[PDB]
Amino acid sequence: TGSEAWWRTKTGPEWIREKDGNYRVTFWWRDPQGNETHSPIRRVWVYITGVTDHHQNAQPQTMARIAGTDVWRWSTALSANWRGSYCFIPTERDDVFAAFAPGETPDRNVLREGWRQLLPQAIADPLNSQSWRGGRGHAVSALEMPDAPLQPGWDRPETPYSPPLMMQWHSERLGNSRRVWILTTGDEAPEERPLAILLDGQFWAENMPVWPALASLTHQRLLPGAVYLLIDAIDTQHRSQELPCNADFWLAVQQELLPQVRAVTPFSDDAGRTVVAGQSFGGLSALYAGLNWPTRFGCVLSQSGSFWWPHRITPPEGEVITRLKTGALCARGLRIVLEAGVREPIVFQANQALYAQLNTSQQSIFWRQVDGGHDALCWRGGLTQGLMLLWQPLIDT
Numbered sequence: 268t269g270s271e272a273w274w275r276t277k278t279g280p281e282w283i284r285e286k287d288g289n290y291r292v293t294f295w296w297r298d299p300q301g302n303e304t305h306s307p308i309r310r311v312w313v314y315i316t317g318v319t320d321h322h323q324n325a326q327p328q329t330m331a332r333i334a335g336t337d338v339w340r341w342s343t344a345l346s347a348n349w350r351g352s353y354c355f356i357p358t359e360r361d362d363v364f365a366a367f368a369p370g371e372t373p374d375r376n377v378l379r380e381g382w383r384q385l386l387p388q389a390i391a392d393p394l395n396s397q398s399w400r401g402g403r404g405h406a407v408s409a410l411e412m413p414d415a416p417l418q419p420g421w422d423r424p425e426t427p428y429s430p431p432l433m434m435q436w437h438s439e440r441l442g443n444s445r446r447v448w449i450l451t452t453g454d455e456a457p458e459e460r461p462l463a464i465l466l467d468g469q470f471w472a473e474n475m476p477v478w479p480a481l482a483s484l485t486h487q488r489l490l491p492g493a494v495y496l497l498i499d500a501i502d503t504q505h506r507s508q509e510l511p512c513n514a515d516f517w518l519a520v521q522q523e524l525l526p527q528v529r530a531v532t533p534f535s536d537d538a539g540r541t542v543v544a545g546q547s548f549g550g551l552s553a554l555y556a557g558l559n560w561p562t563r564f565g566c567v568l569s570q571s572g573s574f575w576w577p578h579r580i581t582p583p584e585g586e587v588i589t590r591l592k593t594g595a596l597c598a599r600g601l602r603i604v605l606e607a608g609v610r611e612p613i614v615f616q617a618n619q620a621l622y623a624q625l626n627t628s629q630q631s632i633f634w635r636q637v638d639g640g641h642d643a644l645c646w647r648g649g650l651t652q653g654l655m656l657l658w659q660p661l662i663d664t
């Protein structure tokens with residue numbers, strides 16, 4: 268153990284199927300500065316989305332080294348259907364988090380604060396080649412248990428016949444400029460092609476490119492030839508101001524953006540196959556769009572929707588949840604995919620309350636629970652599955 272030949276057998280996290288059906292998963296990190304006497308490393312935090320972070324109010328988990336070697340280790344239990352991102356934070360610092368007694372639920376606010384000081388130092392798993400830029404400012408790695416559901420398109424990525432195009436969208440309504448990406452996956456009946464709008468376009472166009480997965484599903488006849496519009500959120504300041512129920516954003520998209528997009532490639536005016544898909548504030552904004560302009564956006568795809576907005580500390584209460592409760596807004600004729608993970612309690616509970624509220628006979632709602640959390644590795648699969656659900660009627664032809 269801890270030898271050169273021993274490290275050769277390690278390809279990343281290892282798992283063992285237990286009696287109950289869950290897995291004992293072990294993580295390994297090789298200290299490049301040697302053993303105790305040589306390496307000045309104090310901590311090696313294991314930050315797994317929805318498992319060891321603030322979403323589970325978990326006490327900060329750090330690895331421990333096997334005395335005498337440069338091997339750090341840490342294990343945990345994970346469900347069979349789970350999938351999620353993770354990263355390690357090897358540091359010399361030991362003055363960030365406070366002490367925690369066994370069985371003490373820490374304050375979530377205190378956790379995020381503590382993590383905001385360490386995450387910039389976070390790194391992907393050097394043993395795992397399935398890594399990418401997380402979008403939050405650090406690299407991450409992918410882990411999937413054997414029964415994680417298939418992620419349509421991402422399993423058989425195929426090159427798109429048409430390359431993605433980029434356009435600079437200058438908004439008079441918003442008073443700012445921004446990038447938008449356009450992908451088309453079919454030329455037949457161009458005016459019948461459904462339009463699908465994806466928020467946080469920068470991520471789905473650069474950090475985790477959605478084109479190969481979309482083209483693959485189209486080639487398999489599991490998605491119709493469509494027109495995909497990815498919109499850049501720009502940055503945190505703008506995104507936090509434009510996505511959480513901001514009417515100008517959607518007014519601007521309809522009056523300024525869609526006509527420009529329509530000038531380059533045709534798409535259907537039928538709200539019934541017009542999708543607005545987003546995650547987190549993007550999910551909230553997509554439903555908000557469908558709720559306020561159902562004549563233009565009839566299909567909503569909300570993944571981990573921030574329906575706890577504006578106040579996170581209070582999950583069941585939400586702005587969109589209040590409008591539906593009184594009667595100002597109503598999902599009539601809308602097809603809605605509402606996804607949320609069990610590893611994001613606040614968000615999950617918020618989505619349940621939202622579901623109960625709008626669940627009437629006058630609309631088609633698809634509830635999807637995910638064994639995972641506030642994680643783009645999971646969302647990527649729900650994104651493609653969600654489009655299949657929202658477009659199920661067309662796809663059947």
Ligand SMILES: [Cl-]
Nearest residue numbers: 361362363364
């Ligand atoms: Cl610490």
Ligand SMILES: [Cl-]
Nearest residue numbers: 400402404405
């Ligand atoms: Cl990043």
